[PDB]
Amino acid sequence: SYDIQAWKKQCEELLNLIFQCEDSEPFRQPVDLLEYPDYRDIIDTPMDFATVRETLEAGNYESPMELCKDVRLIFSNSKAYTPSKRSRIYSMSLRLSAFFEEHISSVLSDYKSALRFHKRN
């Protein structure tokens, strides 16, 4: 299964599934500072799923590893901002992270295999 470009549509479909998840709603738009006034004192690099989708659609990811790094930043930001490990929004982040990781693993494996096959000679 050695298509070097296949990851892009696979990531578009996975983002569609993430947008259908109720657990993604807090992460679909850049955080609002008017509600959470201390946010940029704690978080150096904001990230959200709409920014990920736009970056993919603009053709500004070269690999699914780069997309995976930005999605993992959404989750590390939520862990860095939570006052409690028993927070509603952090709790939604942990379920959504488990879902993401379960689905991205084959995308990454297939891409890396395709690359290796391209370099085989």
Ligand SMILES: O=C(Nc1ccccc1F)N1CCN(C(=O)c2ccco2)CC1
């Ligand atoms: O406001 C947020 N998102 C949001 C944006 C627009 C419309 C509606 C929304 F919900 N947030 C709150 C801050 N975040 C946290 O990860 C967190 C962990 C513990 C408490 O917050 C990120 C998501």
